[PDB]
Coordinates of C-alpha atoms and ligand atoms in Angstrom, one line a residue:
Chain X
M30 CA -22.0 13.1 -11.6
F31 CA -19.2 10.6 -10.3
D32 CA -17.3 8.5 -12.4
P33 CA -16.0 5.4 -13.0
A34 CA -13.0 6.1 -14.9
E35 CA -12.0 9.7 -13.6
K36 CA -8.2 10.6 -14.8
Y37 CA -5.6 13.1 -13.4
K38 CA -5.4 15.8 -14.9
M39 CA -2.2 15.6 -16.9
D40 CA -2.8 18.3 -19.6
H41 CA 0.1 21.4 -17.4
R42 CA 2.5 23.0 -19.3
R43 CA 4.8 20.9 -17.5
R44 CA 5.4 17.2 -15.9
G45 CA 6.7 18.2 -13.0
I46 CA 9.8 17.9 -11.1
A47 CA 11.6 13.8 -10.9
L48 CA 14.1 14.9 -7.6
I49 CA 16.3 11.1 -7.3
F50 CA 18.3 11.4 -4.4
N51 CA 21.6 8.6 -4.8
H52 CA 23.6 7.4 -1.7
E53 CA 26.5 4.3 -2.8
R54 CA 29.0 5.6 0.4
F55 CA 28.8 7.0 3.8
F56 CA 29.5 8.9 6.8
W57 CA 32.7 6.5 8.2
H58 CA 31.6 6.2 11.6
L59 CA 27.7 4.9 10.4
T60 CA 29.7 1.5 8.7
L61 CA 27.2 0.9 6.2
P62 CA 28.1 -0.5 3.6
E63 CA 29.0 0.7 -0.1
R64 CA 26.0 0.5 -2.2
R65 CA 28.1 -0.8 -5.4
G66 CA 25.4 -0.1 -8.8
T67 CA 23.1 3.2 -7.1
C68 CA 24.9 4.6 -10.0
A69 CA 22.8 2.4 -12.8
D70 CA 19.6 2.7 -10.7
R71 CA 19.9 6.4 -11.2
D72 CA 21.0 6.6 -14.9
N73 CA 18.5 4.4 -15.9
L74 CA 15.6 5.8 -13.2
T75 CA 16.7 9.1 -14.6
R76 CA 16.7 8.5 -18.8
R77 CA 12.8 6.6 -17.9
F78 CA 11.6 9.9 -16.2
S79 CA 13.2 12.1 -18.7
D80 CA 11.6 10.5 -21.4
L81 CA 7.5 10.8 -19.8
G82 CA 8.5 14.4 -20.2
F83 CA 10.1 15.1 -16.3
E84 CA 12.4 17.4 -15.5
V85 CA 14.8 15.0 -13.5
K86 CA 17.3 16.6 -10.6
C87 CA 19.5 14.1 -8.9
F88 CA 21.6 14.5 -6.0
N89 CA 24.4 11.8 -5.4
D90 CA 25.7 11.5 -1.2
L91 CA 23.8 14.8 0.0
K92 CA 24.4 15.4 3.5
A93 CA 21.1 15.5 5.6
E94 CA 20.7 18.9 5.8
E95 CA 21.9 19.4 2.2
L96 CA 19.0 17.1 1.5
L97 CA 16.0 19.3 4.0
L98 CA 17.2 22.4 2.3
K99 CA 16.9 20.8 -1.5
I100 CA 14.1 19.0 -0.7
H101 CA 12.3 21.9 0.6
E102 CA 13.4 24.0 -1.4
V103 CA 11.3 21.8 -4.3
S104 CA 8.9 22.0 -2.2
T105 CA 8.0 26.1 -1.4
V106 CA 8.5 26.5 -5.7
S107 CA 5.1 26.8 -7.4
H108 CA 4.1 22.9 -9.1
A109 CA 1.1 25.1 -10.3
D110 CA 1.9 24.6 -14.2
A111 CA 2.5 20.4 -13.4
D112 CA 0.3 17.4 -14.1
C113 CA 2.6 15.7 -10.6
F114 CA 5.6 15.9 -8.4
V115 CA 8.2 12.4 -8.0
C116 CA 11.0 11.5 -5.4
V117 CA 13.4 8.9 -5.7
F118 CA 15.4 7.6 -2.6
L119 CA 18.4 5.1 -3.6
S120 CA 19.7 5.0 0.4
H121 CA 19.8 2.1 3.3
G122 CA 16.6 2.7 5.1
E123 CA 16.1 1.3 8.9
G124 CA 11.7 2.6 10.2
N125 CA 10.6 4.9 8.9
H126 CA 14.1 6.2 7.9
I127 CA 16.6 7.1 5.3
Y128 CA 19.8 7.9 5.4
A129 CA 21.7 10.6 4.1
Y130 CA 25.7 10.3 3.9
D131 CA 25.4 12.0 7.3
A132 CA 22.6 10.4 10.0
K133 CA 18.6 9.3 8.7
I134 CA 15.6 11.3 7.8
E135 CA 11.8 10.4 9.0
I136 CA 10.4 9.4 5.3
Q137 CA 6.9 11.9 7.1
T138 CA 8.6 14.7 7.8
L139 CA 10.4 14.9 3.5
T140 CA 6.5 13.3 2.5
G141 CA 5.3 15.9 4.8
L142 CA 6.8 18.4 3.0
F143 CA 4.0 17.9 -0.5
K144 CA 1.1 17.5 1.7
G145 CA -2.2 19.8 0.9
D146 CA -1.8 21.6 4.0
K147 CA 2.3 22.8 3.0
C148 CA 2.2 22.6 -1.1
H149 CA -0.8 24.9 -2.4
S150 CA 0.2 24.0 -5.7
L151 CA 0.2 20.3 -6.1
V152 CA -3.5 19.7 -4.0
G153 CA -5.0 16.9 -5.8
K154 CA -1.8 15.7 -8.3
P155 CA -0.1 12.0 -6.9
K156 CA 3.4 13.6 -5.5
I157 CA 4.7 9.8 -5.9
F158 CA 7.9 8.8 -3.8
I159 CA 9.5 6.1 -4.9
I160 CA 11.6 3.4 -2.4
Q161 CA 14.6 1.6 -2.1
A162 CA 15.9 0.9 0.2
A163 CA 16.9 -1.8 3.2
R164 CA 19.3 -2.8 6.3
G165 CA 23.6 -2.1 5.9
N166 CA 24.9 -5.5 5.5
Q167 CA 28.8 -6.2 6.6
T187 CA 32.6 -8.5 -11.7
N188 CA 28.8 -8.5 -11.3
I189 CA 28.0 -9.5 -7.8
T190 CA 24.3 -9.5 -6.6
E191 CA 24.4 -8.7 -3.1
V192 CA 21.5 -8.7 -1.0
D193 CA 19.9 -6.9 2.2
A194 CA 16.2 -8.1 4.1
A195 CA 13.7 -5.4 3.8
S196 CA 13.9 -2.6 7.0
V197 CA 11.8 0.1 5.9
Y198 CA 8.5 0.2 6.8
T199 CA 5.7 0.4 3.5
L200 CA 3.9 3.9 4.6
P201 CA 1.0 5.5 3.8
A202 CA 1.5 9.5 3.3
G203 CA -1.6 11.5 2.6
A204 CA -4.7 12.1 0.1
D205 CA -2.7 11.8 -3.6
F206 CA 0.2 9.8 -2.5
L207 CA 1.7 6.8 -3.7
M208 CA 4.4 5.1 -1.5
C209 CA 6.6 2.3 -4.2
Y210 CA 9.1 0.3 -2.4
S211 CA 11.5 -2.1 -3.1
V212 CA 11.0 -4.6 -1.1
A213 CA 7.7 -5.6 2.2
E214 CA 8.4 -7.2 5.7
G215 CA 10.0 -11.0 5.2
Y216 CA 11.2 -10.2 2.6
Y217 CA 14.4 -9.9 0.5
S218 CA 16.1 -6.5 -1.9
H219 CA 18.3 -7.4 -4.4
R220 CA 21.2 -5.6 -6.8
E221 CA 23.9 -6.5 -8.9
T222 CA 27.1 -4.2 -8.6
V223 CA 27.0 -3.5 -12.4
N224 CA 23.0 -3.5 -13.5
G225 CA 21.7 -2.3 -10.2
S226 CA 18.3 -3.3 -8.1
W227 CA 16.2 -5.7 -9.7
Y228 CA 13.9 -3.3 -8.3
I229 CA 14.7 -0.8 -10.6
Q230 CA 15.7 -2.8 -13.3
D231 CA 12.4 -3.8 -13.0
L232 CA 10.7 0.0 -12.6
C233 CA 12.3 0.7 -15.6
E234 CA 12.2 -1.7 -18.1
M235 CA 8.4 -1.8 -17.7
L236 CA 9.0 2.6 -17.6
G237 CA 10.5 1.9 -21.2
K238 CA 8.0 -1.0 -22.6
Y239 CA 4.7 1.1 -21.1
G240 CA 5.4 4.3 -18.7
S241 CA 3.3 5.6 -22.2
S242 CA 0.0 4.1 -22.5
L243 CA -0.4 2.0 -19.1
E244 CA -2.5 3.5 -15.9
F245 CA 1.0 3.7 -13.6
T246 CA -0.7 1.5 -10.8
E247 CA -0.8 -1.4 -13.0
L248 CA 2.3 -0.6 -14.6
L249 CA 3.5 -1.4 -10.9
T250 CA 1.8 -4.0 -10.6
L251 CA 3.2 -5.6 -13.9
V252 CA 7.5 -5.0 -11.0
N253 CA 5.5 -6.9 -8.9
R254 CA 4.9 -9.9 -11.1
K255 CA 8.3 -9.3 -12.3
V256 CA 10.4 -9.0 -9.3
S257 CA 8.2 -12.3 -7.4
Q258 CA 8.6 -13.8 -10.6
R259 CA 12.9 -13.7 -10.7
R260 CA 14.4 -17.1 -9.4
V261 CA 16.3 -18.3 -6.0
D262 CA 17.5 -21.3 -6.1
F263 CA 20.2 -21.9 -7.2
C264 CA 22.7 -18.8 -6.5
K265 CA 26.3 -18.4 -6.6
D266 CA 26.3 -17.9 -2.7
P267 CA 24.0 -20.5 -0.8
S268 CA 23.8 -18.8 2.0
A269 CA 21.2 -16.4 -0.6
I270 CA 18.7 -19.2 -1.8
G271 CA 15.5 -19.3 -1.0
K272 CA 15.3 -14.7 -0.3
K273 CA 12.6 -14.2 -2.3
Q274 CA 11.9 -10.9 -2.9
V275 CA 7.6 -8.9 -3.1
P276 CA 7.8 -5.3 -3.5
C277 CA 4.3 -3.4 -2.8
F278 CA 2.5 0.2 -3.5
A279 CA 0.4 2.3 -1.0
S280 CA -1.9 3.6 -2.9
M281 CA -3.0 6.7 -1.8
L282 CA -4.9 8.1 -5.6
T283 CA -7.8 9.4 -6.1
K284 CA -7.6 8.8 -9.4
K285 CA -6.4 7.1 -12.5
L286 CA -2.4 8.1 -13.2
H287 CA -1.6 8.5 -16.8
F288 CA 1.7 9.6 -19.0
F289 CA 0.5 9.7 -21.4
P290 CA 2.8 11.6 -24.0
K291 CA 2.2 15.7 -23.6
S292 CA 1.5 17.8 -26.6
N293 CA 4.0 20.4 -27.3
Chain L
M30 CA 5.3 -14.3 -24.3
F31 CA 5.1 -11.5 -21.0
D32 CA 1.1 -10.1 -20.8
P33 CA 0.9 -6.8 -19.3
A34 CA -3.0 -7.2 -19.1
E35 CA -2.8 -10.7 -17.7
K36 CA -5.9 -11.3 -15.1
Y37 CA -5.8 -14.1 -12.3
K38 CA -7.8 -16.6 -13.2
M39 CA -10.5 -16.3 -11.7
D40 CA -13.9 -18.7 -14.1
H41 CA -13.1 -22.0 -10.5
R42 CA -15.8 -24.0 -9.1
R43 CA -16.6 -21.1 -6.4
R44 CA -15.7 -18.1 -5.9
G45 CA -14.3 -18.7 -2.3
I46 CA -14.6 -17.7 1.2
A47 CA -15.0 -14.5 3.0
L48 CA -14.3 -14.6 7.0
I49 CA -16.0 -11.5 9.0
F50 CA -14.8 -11.1 12.4
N51 CA -17.1 -8.2 13.8
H52 CA -16.1 -7.3 16.6
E53 CA -18.7 -4.8 19.4
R54 CA -17.5 -5.0 22.2
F55 CA -14.8 -6.1 24.7
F56 CA -13.8 -8.3 28.6
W57 CA -14.7 -5.1 30.5
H58 CA -11.5 -5.1 31.3
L59 CA -10.1 -3.8 28.0
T60 CA -11.3 -0.7 28.9
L61 CA -12.2 -0.3 25.2
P62 CA -15.9 1.3 24.2
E63 CA -19.0 -0.6 22.0
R64 CA -18.1 0.2 18.4
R65 CA -21.8 1.2 17.8
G66 CA -23.1 0.8 14.0
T67 CA -20.3 -2.7 12.6
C68 CA -22.7 -4.8 13.0
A69 CA -24.5 -2.1 9.7
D70 CA -20.5 -2.9 8.1
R71 CA -20.4 -6.4 9.1
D72 CA -24.1 -7.2 7.4
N73 CA -23.5 -4.3 4.4
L74 CA -20.3 -6.3 3.5
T75 CA -22.1 -9.7 4.1
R76 CA -24.4 -8.4 0.9
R77 CA -22.1 -7.5 -1.8
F78 CA -19.7 -9.7 -1.1
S79 CA -22.6 -12.4 -1.2
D80 CA -23.5 -10.8 -5.1
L81 CA -20.2 -11.1 -5.8
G82 CA -20.1 -14.5 -5.3
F83 CA -18.4 -16.4 -1.7
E84 CA -19.3 -18.0 0.7
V85 CA -19.7 -15.1 3.6
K86 CA -19.3 -16.6 7.4
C87 CA -20.0 -13.6 10.1
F88 CA -17.9 -14.5 13.2
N89 CA -19.6 -11.4 16.2
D90 CA -17.4 -11.2 19.9
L91 CA -14.5 -14.3 19.4
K92 CA -11.9 -14.2 22.2
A93 CA -8.5 -15.4 21.1
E94 CA -8.1 -18.7 20.9
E95 CA -12.1 -18.9 19.0
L96 CA -10.3 -16.7 16.0
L97 CA -7.1 -18.2 16.0
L98 CA -9.5 -21.8 15.8
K99 CA -12.0 -20.1 13.2
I100 CA -9.3 -18.6 10.8
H101 CA -6.6 -21.7 10.9
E102 CA -9.4 -24.4 10.0
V103 CA -10.1 -22.3 7.3
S104 CA -6.6 -21.7 6.1
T105 CA -5.5 -25.7 6.3
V106 CA -9.3 -26.8 4.8
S107 CA -8.5 -27.1 0.7
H108 CA -9.0 -24.1 -2.2
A109 CA -7.7 -25.7 -4.4
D110 CA -11.3 -25.1 -6.7
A111 CA -11.7 -21.2 -5.4
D112 CA -11.2 -18.7 -7.2
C113 CA -9.3 -16.4 -4.0
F114 CA -9.5 -15.5 -0.6
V115 CA -11.2 -12.8 2.1
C116 CA -10.8 -11.3 5.0
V117 CA -12.1 -8.7 7.1
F118 CA -12.1 -7.5 10.6
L119 CA -14.0 -4.3 12.3
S120 CA -12.2 -4.2 15.7
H121 CA -10.4 -1.7 17.4
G122 CA -6.3 -1.7 17.4
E123 CA -3.1 -0.4 17.6
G124 CA -0.3 -1.0 15.3
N125 CA 0.9 -4.5 14.2
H126 CA -2.4 -5.8 16.3
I127 CA -6.4 -6.8 16.0
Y128 CA -7.9 -6.6 18.8
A129 CA -10.9 -9.7 19.5
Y130 CA -13.1 -10.3 22.6
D131 CA -9.7 -11.3 25.0
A132 CA -7.0 -9.8 23.7
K133 CA -5.1 -8.6 21.0
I134 CA -3.2 -10.9 18.1
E135 CA -0.2 -10.3 15.8
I136 CA -1.9 -9.2 12.1
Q137 CA 1.0 -11.0 10.4
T138 CA 0.3 -14.6 11.9
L139 CA -3.8 -13.7 10.6
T140 CA -2.6 -13.6 7.3
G141 CA 0.7 -15.8 7.2
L142 CA -1.6 -19.0 7.9
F143 CA -2.4 -18.4 4.3
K144 CA 1.5 -17.5 2.7
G145 CA 2.3 -19.8 -0.3
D146 CA 3.8 -22.1 2.0
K147 CA 2.0 -22.4 4.7
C148 CA -1.7 -22.2 2.5
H149 CA -0.7 -24.8 -1.2
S150 CA -4.4 -24.6 -2.9
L151 CA -3.6 -20.8 -2.5
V152 CA -0.6 -19.4 -3.9
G153 CA -0.9 -17.4 -7.7
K154 CA -4.9 -16.9 -5.5
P155 CA -5.6 -12.8 -4.6
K156 CA -5.8 -13.3 -0.5
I157 CA -7.6 -9.7 0.3
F158 CA -7.7 -8.4 3.7
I159 CA -9.8 -5.7 4.6
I160 CA -8.7 -3.6 8.2
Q161 CA -11.5 -1.0 9.4
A162 CA -9.4 -0.8 12.8
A163 CA -8.6 1.6 15.1
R164 CA -8.0 3.6 19.0
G165 CA -10.4 3.1 20.7
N166 CA -11.3 6.5 23.2
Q167 CA -12.1 6.8 26.8
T187 CA -29.2 9.0 17.3
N188 CA -27.3 8.4 15.2
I189 CA -24.1 10.3 16.7
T190 CA -20.6 9.9 13.9
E191 CA -17.9 8.7 16.8
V192 CA -14.0 10.0 15.1
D193 CA -11.2 7.8 15.6
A194 CA -8.2 8.5 15.7
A195 CA -5.7 5.6 13.2
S196 CA -3.5 3.3 14.9
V197 CA -3.5 0.3 12.2
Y198 CA 0.1 0.1 10.6
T199 CA -1.1 -0.2 6.5
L200 CA 1.3 -3.5 6.8
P201 CA 2.4 -5.3 3.3
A202 CA 1.8 -8.8 3.4
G203 CA 3.9 -10.8 0.7
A204 CA 2.7 -11.5 -3.6
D205 CA -0.8 -11.8 -4.1
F206 CA -1.9 -10.2 -0.5
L207 CA -4.2 -6.7 -0.6
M208 CA -4.6 -5.5 2.4
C209 CA -7.0 -2.0 3.0
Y210 CA -7.4 -0.3 5.1
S211 CA -10.3 2.4 6.3
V212 CA -7.6 5.5 6.8
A213 CA -3.6 5.7 7.6
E214 CA -1.1 7.4 10.0
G215 CA -2.4 11.1 10.5
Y216 CA -6.1 11.0 9.1
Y217 CA -9.7 9.3 11.5
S218 CA -11.8 6.8 11.1
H219 CA -15.1 8.2 10.8
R220 CA -18.2 5.4 13.0
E221 CA -21.7 6.2 12.1
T222 CA -23.9 4.5 14.8
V223 CA -26.7 3.6 12.7
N224 CA -25.1 3.3 9.5
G225 CA -21.6 2.1 10.9
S226 CA -17.9 3.5 9.1
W227 CA -17.7 5.8 5.4
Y228 CA -15.0 3.3 4.7
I229 CA -17.0 0.6 4.8
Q230 CA -20.2 2.6 3.6
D231 CA -18.5 3.8 0.7
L232 CA -16.2 0.6 -0.4
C233 CA -19.5 -1.3 -0.2
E234 CA -21.3 1.3 -2.3
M235 CA -19.0 0.9 -4.8
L236 CA -18.7 -3.4 -4.3
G237 CA -22.8 -2.8 -5.8
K238 CA -22.8 -0.5 -8.3
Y239 CA -18.9 -1.4 -9.7
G240 CA -17.8 -4.8 -8.0
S241 CA -19.5 -7.6 -10.8
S242 CA -17.3 -4.8 -13.8
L243 CA -14.2 -2.6 -12.6
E244 CA -10.8 -3.8 -11.3
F245 CA -10.3 -4.5 -7.7
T246 CA -8.1 -1.7 -7.1
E247 CA -9.1 0.3 -9.8
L248 CA -12.7 0.1 -7.6
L249 CA -10.2 0.6 -4.0
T250 CA -9.4 4.0 -6.0
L251 CA -13.2 5.1 -5.8
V252 CA -13.3 4.8 -2.6
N253 CA -10.1 6.5 -1.3
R254 CA -11.8 8.5 -2.9
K255 CA -15.5 9.2 -2.2
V256 CA -14.7 8.8 1.4
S257 CA -11.1 11.7 1.2
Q258 CA -14.3 13.9 -0.7
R259 CA -16.4 13.2 2.1
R260 CA -16.3 17.0 4.5
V261 CA -15.1 17.1 7.9
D262 CA -15.7 21.3 8.6
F263 CA -19.6 21.3 9.5
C264 CA -19.4 18.9 12.1
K265 CA -22.4 18.7 14.8
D266 CA -19.5 17.9 17.8
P267 CA -16.4 20.9 17.5
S268 CA -13.9 18.7 18.1
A269 CA -14.2 16.2 15.5
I270 CA -13.5 19.2 12.4
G271 CA -11.1 19.3 9.8
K272 CA -10.5 15.5 11.1
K273 CA -10.3 14.2 7.4
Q274 CA -10.3 10.4 7.1
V275 CA -8.0 9.3 3.8
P276 CA -7.7 5.4 3.0
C277 CA -5.2 3.3 1.6
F278 CA -4.0 -0.3 0.6
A279 CA -1.2 -2.0 0.2
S280 CA -1.4 -4.0 -3.3
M281 CA 1.0 -6.6 -3.4
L282 CA -1.3 -8.3 -6.3
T283 CA 1.0 -9.4 -10.0
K284 CA -2.0 -9.5 -12.1
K285 CA -5.4 -7.6 -12.5
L286 CA -7.6 -8.9 -9.8
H287 CA -12.2 -8.8 -11.2
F288 CA -15.0 -10.5 -9.6
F289 CA -17.3 -11.3 -13.0
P290 CA -19.8 -12.8 -12.3
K291 CA -19.6 -16.0 -12.5
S292 CA -21.3 -18.6 -14.7
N293 CA -23.5 -21.1 -13.2
Ligands
LIG1 O1 6.6 -2.7 6.5 C1 7.1 -3.2 6.8 C2 8.4 -2.8 6.2 C3 9.6 -4.1 6.8 F1 11.0 -3.7 6.3 C4 9.5 -3.6 8.3 C5 8.6 -4.0 9.3 C6 7.6 -4.0 8.3 C7 5.8 -3.2 8.9 N1 6.3 -1.9 9.9 C8 5.4 -0.9 9.5 N2 3.8 -0.8 7.7 C9 4.1 0.1 7.5 C10 3.3 1.3 8.8 C11 3.9 1.7 9.4 C12 4.7 0.5 10.2 C13 4.6 0.7 11.4 C14 5.8 1.2 12.3 C15 6.3 1.4 13.2 O2 6.5 -0.4 13.6 N3 5.9 -0.2 12.0

């Protein structure tokens, strides 16, 4: 009795964990610029995910070893009584890699820890990764980075969400934060608790795509449009309806 | 007045063109196997897209020059009186590339022809690419290929749809056709004219992911699961409601 309107079962005791890895500064010998504004992104994401019932765990400027430890820890704890898992990266990236403070890490080995094989308690539950990462460039200025992180899929019941697609540019206001994360957080506030999550991400695609880039204080930043995307491997409608205490 | 339920305007005179590039056989010196069953994929897609009002144009085993000519032709004709554009590749692929009969072509240069810049008549209209392409290995049998084609995004208002994700395997029955395209076509038949198209593709993710791979006639084909994905850069809900004559 196959159902075209099947929703992920979101009636477990807890919503689940939202990891946020937040990277502002980098080891000198990496020659990567400060990401002034990333704290606004971390704080905005933390508030909006908290209001949808996530236990939000933030980590600032972890070295590779510490990041792998924290994310492995979370992968081997039980999610049996959880709706889903969210993991956010705010850093620089290149290709299949995100930057820790120290060094780059393959995204596939981070997403791999939550695959059915390796994390039984999350099988058939949504695993959502959100990635604001681009190429390290060099009061409220708008900085623009070229897209650099591949828009990779991840496995059954993963949703990979990307600030920017190949050939487009990602924008970060040094006080207000990343265009992508501002618009994501605005949509989570207005609609997080009602709209299907891919419907919401589609709103975010519209909001960010519509941001005008013809009249810029920096001339070289003109016509550098931003288009985000998501790569869905979801098998059901995903909603974050308020949980009944 | 920003609207969370905005639909793409799908009330133009014609639905639009669906290109289908169908590749069964390859130049000897490419050492690529026949794709026995791809004709079932072509015929199934042709029927289901026709019933949703597409002018379906099929091309069998085009050399690179011919394919570039046909797709450039379609890109420079006017889509002003059209709802959208669909383009399907049934071939082998590797990374950035789809195989013509002759040689490989960068997917970015095919999707590039329909970007706002280069095709004014499709600006703000959905551009949907469906790609059944994997790595060619050196009565109704099930053949299994490793995933090989990158799940690339494409630009504002593109939807890129992929038979299989990194690390998974794509299946083709030599009479019935590709698992992905069978399940896509079944869902188009039941739900094409009612469901939002990304909702439908999510059904296809469930159907294909749920196909069992533990009891196979070939032992070496066991545990080779298939998970499709889509990379959405859509900005609105997309529906293929019946057109009013
Ligand atoms: O999507 C982007 C985004 C960028 F910023 C830059 C480039 C691509 C295209 N690459 C891929 N996309 C998806 C899965 C794999 C790749 C891949 C792997 C090895 O080379 N490419």
